[model samples]
Target: SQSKYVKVWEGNLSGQRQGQPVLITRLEGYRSASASDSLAANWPPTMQIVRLISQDHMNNKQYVGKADFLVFRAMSQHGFLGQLQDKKLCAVIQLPSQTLLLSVSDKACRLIGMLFPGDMVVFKPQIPNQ
Candidate 1:
């Protein structure tokens, strides 16, 4: 399982102030992917892959090169944000290659039921403004 995957990096998704809206991060997949780029057939459906964007702090640390490529949750009426409660959150992702799974704190998992292999997901919590 996790031992077989290579961890790129881990980080937190939090807000700067109280009552702040939840954030969403979006991702796109590389050109032409296959089964090797996605989670295995036996993996749970709740798992997904979120690729960190162009800029983030993790790129500066060891074992973490680009700090990109990255959450979980059942969607509510308003969507993912409707069910989210915590402001400060943390999660871990693993990947032997392009495929990865997000493991949130408190043993919770984030994101939609299925993430296509080699696909990049943008977990947007609040409505998009720009």
Candidate 2:
């Protein structure tokens, strides 16, 4: 199958949380949680977050996840959300475990298995291979 995924952004985890492992990224601007309050506002849009789940090329980016308003709300509820930076929003996506963060291709970029406050990450489009 032609994959509906393409590399977008790459960075380190930079931070950690108490509950589940997650990936945090910077959105273009200050995003209001209310905009994601309902699908009517295009809340659950087409895109999703994918974790590099394996070391080998054929086994990477194996699973999908989301960083929707619902997840944003939870971050706020748990006080994990942070202030805006240059009008950018801190987007958070809950992950299944810490292991995924250590699955990157570059050993130097890959996490040390702890997913500490400064681990690296990669992002791909979830709905288009472009």
Candidate 3:
């Protein structure tokens, strides 16, 4: 018998106004990864070492001495909108990374999904039990 995984961390990105966009405050690998510097992975991330670029989102923000054990928030579709129904984060945020592209579609920008300082993301071990 095998089948199960879990969420390690989750942070809401609820502070994007006037199109500033919610930013990735941290990256906690809840699943698995592919390379040394990849933002995308096997649905969820597992590795601790992340690849942040010079012009990447992790640049010029803030850091202690090195990058923390980063974790990524998954893309939410309803995923849960009407439930909250009165907030920007619960209003204009779908893909964690896609939030930056809202300006292109004014309508989309207005009717995105929800996000907060601690959103949500989960995954499971595909190989029975590890």
Candidate 4:
């Protein structure tokens, strides 16, 4: 059997981009659960949270966090890039306490299928080098 899920969050980005809109759409196995229940056996038992941050393409500056470079490098080395399109990328990041953060964006979704162990991809704010 198969199912579908959807969620909508409307807000400003980085407090600097007032009224800026962003939308996160999760498909396939990533479905939303009811607030009444803490656990959903059908869904992944582990806590897997994802966030979305939209940026203006012109500046190459991110109002949100920047992507993790190390994770990007590792993924590229492991031939993970073959799984994604040239415009897509993916990576993993580890928190100070060793917690893992699995992230997939348009670039990630286009490029990688699965994330390897001990890696995380975080979004960082940065201006384009150019």
Candidate 5:
């Protein structure tokens, strides 16, 4: 058995949250010319950002694991920016109207592109079946 899920961008909350700063820090550590060159060689023609829109887990313990939105981007070679691994992609979502900065690891970003947008991305939870 299986199920499907989708996330849509509501706004740009990248610079407004604590998590954004932490993600930026991690991205800075991963940016490099060597890395960028390698990624460009195998880059996807298009990419998407799957923004997880949810309240702080600690703030709302009951709804700790809910996602909010997923945004998509289609760009040409010149339009693409930043290293694939670091926080290369930043989007200004128009819906809810917020900025989101993504810090995707090299492997993860590759997987995302390979998986393609508007498709299911499934992962098993740690908990046993309810």
Candidate 6:
């Protein structure tokens, strides 16, 4: 189901950019290595350097089986979540504090196959037409 007005915003991790900000219909909770999501068993996830993941990269791990890569991975030790974007299956990698990743739609996949952790990302709310 779509909302008449989906909440959105304009912001980034460390830079400025231009484009349609990522759209989100809902916020999701993450998986865990243990019981009770409150535990930090995963929170203390290994500090990672952000970067774009290529098709080959995703394919290389193909042995991981037929897990739908469309809406992010199901087996996440950290707080990864998914939701429908425009009534399609897409993924969004986020934390309770912010949006860290997203699943690319056909339009998005055509455009967002890779990510630059160093470069500024244009993440903001969509403005309505008057």
The most accurate candidate by lDDT is: 1
* lDDT, candidate 3, at 43: 27
Listed in order, each prediction's TM-score against the native is: 0.21, 0.18, 0.18, 0.19, 0.23, 0.22
Give the per-residue lDDT digits (tens) of candidate 4, residues 1-130: 1222222222221111122322222322222221111222322222232422221221232411232111111212233344333423332322233332333334432221221223343324454111
Model 5, 45-100: lDDT tens digits are 22234453211212332322322222233122222334343444333211232222
Query: Global lDDT of each model?
Result: 0.28, 0.25, 0.27, 0.25, 0.27, 0.26
Model 6: per-residue Cα lDDT at residue 130: 11
lDDT of 2 by residue, 1-130 (tens): 2222222222222343343333544321122222222222332222223442233322322322222111211121122122211221222323443221322222221121111111333345554221
Off by over 4 Å in 6: 1-22, 27-49, 62-130
TM-score of 2: 0.18
Model with the higher TM-score, candidate 5 or 6:
5
- Scored against the true structure, residue 78 in model 2 reaches a CA lDDT of 27
Off by over 4 Å in 1: 1-35, 38-40, 44-73, 76-87, 91-130
Which parts of model 2 are misplaced by more than 4 Å? 1-14, 17-52, 56-102, 110-130
- Model 1 RMSD in angstroms: 16.0
Q: Which ranges in model 4 have alpha carbons more than 4 Å from their true place?
A: 1-60, 64-76, 97-130
lDDT of 5 at 24: 16
